[PDB]
Paper text:
The large family of Gram-positive quorum-sensing receptors known as the RNPP proteins consists of receptors homologous to the Rap, NprR, PlcR, and PrgX proteins that are regulated by imported oligopeptide autoinducers. Rap proteins are phosphatases and transcriptional anti-activators, and NprR, PlcR, and PrgX proteins are DNA binding transcription factors. Rap proteins and their inhibitory oligopeptides, called Phr peptides, have been most extensively studied in [name], which encodes 11 Rap proteins on its chromosome and another five on plasmids. Sequence and structural analysis shows that the Rap proteins are repeat proteins consisting of nine HTH TPR or TPR-like folds, which pack together to form a right-handed superhelical TPR domain.
Following the discovery that [name] and PhrC form a regulatory pair, we crystallized and determined the 2.16 Å resolution X-ray crystal structure of the [name]-PhrC complex. Readily interpretable electron density corresponding to each residue in the PhrC pentapeptide was observed, and PhrC was modeled only after the [name] model was nearly complete. Relative to its position in the RapH-Spo0F and RapF-ComAC structures, the entire N-terminal 3-helix bundle and linker region have dramatically flipped and repacked against the N-terminal surface of the C-terminal TPR domain in the [name]-PhrC structure. In fact, the [name] 3-helix bundle (residues 1–70) and helix-containing linker region (residues 71–94) merge with the C-terminal TPR domain (residues 95–373) to form one extended TPR domain (residues 1–373). In contrast, in the [name]-PhrC structure, the ligand-binding groove is closed. PhrC binding stabilizes a closed [name] conformation that differs from the open RapI conformation due to a compression of [name] along the TPR superhelical axis. The [name]-PhrC structure revealed that [name] residue Asp192 forms a salt-bridge with PhrC residue Arg2. [name]-PhrC interface mutations E147A, Y150F, D192A, N225A, F250A, and K300E resulted in a complete loss of sensitivity to PhrC and, together with previous mutagenesis studies, confirm the biological importance of the crystallographically identified [name]-PhrC interface. New intramolecular [name] contacts that form as a result of the PhrC-induced compression stabilize the [name] closed conformation and are necessary for PhrC inhibition of [name] Spo0F phosphatase activity.
Author numbering:
A (entry chain D), B (entry chain C): 1 to 5
C (entry chain A): 6 to 71, 78 to 89, 93 to 371
D (entry chain B): 7 to 71, 78 to 371
The structure:
Amino acid sequence: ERGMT
Amino acid sequence: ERGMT
Amino acid sequence: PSEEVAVKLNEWYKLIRAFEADQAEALKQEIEYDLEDMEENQDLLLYFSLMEFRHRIMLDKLMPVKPFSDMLNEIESNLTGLLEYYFYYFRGMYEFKQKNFILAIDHYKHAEEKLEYVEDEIEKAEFLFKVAEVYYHIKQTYFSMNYASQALDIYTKYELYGRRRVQCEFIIAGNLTDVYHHEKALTHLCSALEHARQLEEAYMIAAAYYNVGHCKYSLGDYKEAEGYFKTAAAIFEEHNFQQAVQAVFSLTHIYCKEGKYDKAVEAYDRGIKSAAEWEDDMYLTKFRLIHELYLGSGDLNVLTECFDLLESRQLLADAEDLLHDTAERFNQLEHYESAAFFYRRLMNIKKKLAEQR
Amino acid sequence: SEEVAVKLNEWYKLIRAFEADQAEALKQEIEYDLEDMEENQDLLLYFSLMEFRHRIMLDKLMPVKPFSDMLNEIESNQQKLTGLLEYYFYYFRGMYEFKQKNFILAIDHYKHAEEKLEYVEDEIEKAEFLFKVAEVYYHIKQTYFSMNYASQALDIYTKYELYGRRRVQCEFIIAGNLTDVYHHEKALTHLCSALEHARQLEEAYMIAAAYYNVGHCKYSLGDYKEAEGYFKTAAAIFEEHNFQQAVQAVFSLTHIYCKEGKYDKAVEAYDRGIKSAAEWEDDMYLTKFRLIHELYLGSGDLNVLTECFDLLESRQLLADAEDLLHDTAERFNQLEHYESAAFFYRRLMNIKKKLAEQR
Ligand SMILES: [Cl-]
Ligand SMILES: [Cl-]
């Protein structure tokens, strides 16, 4: 998964 | 392989 | 009045970028009310429509719900200089939100050509961040790193420690994790976490927690990462953010890898329920993938179908992670044929990711 | 004093322009001027650095089948080095480490030299530095930084209309990077321009290198039949002018024969290659020949393959190791030897991880 912003 | 220079 | 409403429109834009929903809404209602008592000014009306679009983006970020395309079509049905910049930039923001990363970049790049019309350096910093943000989601590490660094340097220079600065730290760490520099990523994340706490915004604190768990998970420390995913999931769920779906997913996934199948099932049920309420078909696909892999019979047709949906949706970074996990899982079970099958597809995905550079 | 110091800089210009005969004549003139003067450690350290750079050029033009000696002598007085000479210190040693295929060390030297790039007086000289950086970045598959440095270098040569060896080499690097991201058509366009530019230079080495790179690009594209002739042509030119690059050319030729299933030609090319590699004392290509022979012409013994990859990795040739691992994994996968395929897929993962963390 991609990190959150 | 790597290209030549 | 046409020159004064433009001033109000710019003040409205400032409030939007500062996430001042209440003040922005009051100014929005005032401007829209005053435009009804004015002559028909074309460029001025297009100015408003663009800003209303940007306004709705901000509102949905702060208060998401489970009309965007409608007002997008009206905008696209209709520009030069500043308005052309807004046109590509705001549509780029929307495409990123809709997970259309390639299109979002294309829009941003066209907007970047008109960046000379931006006099506010802080405003430019936001733009640079959004560019860095989208590059990260397609694993273009060094383009993302460069833009994120430029943005971070501006926020630091003005000592503006808001949401955007923390987000910059998130992206930098995310990029570091992608190149397996976990120690440096953690340094950025621990700074970002404290900065998030100072903002006193639950969204950013939860995101900071998730990112720490994300980094530790990549590092291999599953025990620590579990607690961070749990905390992030709880906070996001309390404030009804859609980010709770991803948080619970990562929590479910890590339970599976830890062998804690009881907790995995419990987290799975919680996750698919949340994903269904948010109508998140893509996370429903992801939940189905890991359930079949860890909690099911590992049927290759079911797995392949899930990966087919991910790839067709162009979520290549996510597919890459899950393919690696799938191949590794079959390998340790000594199902070498199935393992080789997913290693090959993992190769194909890495190539696709690289080709998009 | 300043006069001989000017000669040293004039010597540097001849070296960078690959003017071997003129560089040699001026070196001897400087040597005579140094022995007929008082004790000058500033110019003696200047000469030693420039002598090192000089030998690098000579070896490139005329390779043979005392660098370490000169290296240690310079390093013994590195505490005296400052400003310009300190720049040369890191730059020249970075160039030498690239030759020795110590890429990470070469970059570290280059980055330190880059901190003092202000001591470079003209853009053309600067362009050479930018190419060398782009060159080493390409060999560790740092595509982004390599493209950036190569583009800066190429723009300078284009701006000043300098169509020499360095410009052609910039085109090679840009094309190589494009191939690494599978933009083969864009790469081929650059290589076709580089080939004609190499022919205009009338330098056999560059023409042969151009032919190899086209073959290298087409090989990556999957056009195996076309890539054959380019590898053969390059191998012939390199051998006729006694260049060590003939080894790599024959290896790629051997490898592609193996892939096509042309085992008779593969065998002949294999014997030709290992014999050539033995003459050049090229242990790494001997290992590479051993690897592909086992994989294609042999039993495919996993222990032999593992040992070969262990050797490549121990020499930090990760880019080449990545290619051969992918080829090995896919080969076993096509042959439905799934356990062996999975084994090499994981080692491929490990190498890709190491490649990613080095950047
Ligand atoms: Cl902010
Ligand atoms: Cl040149």
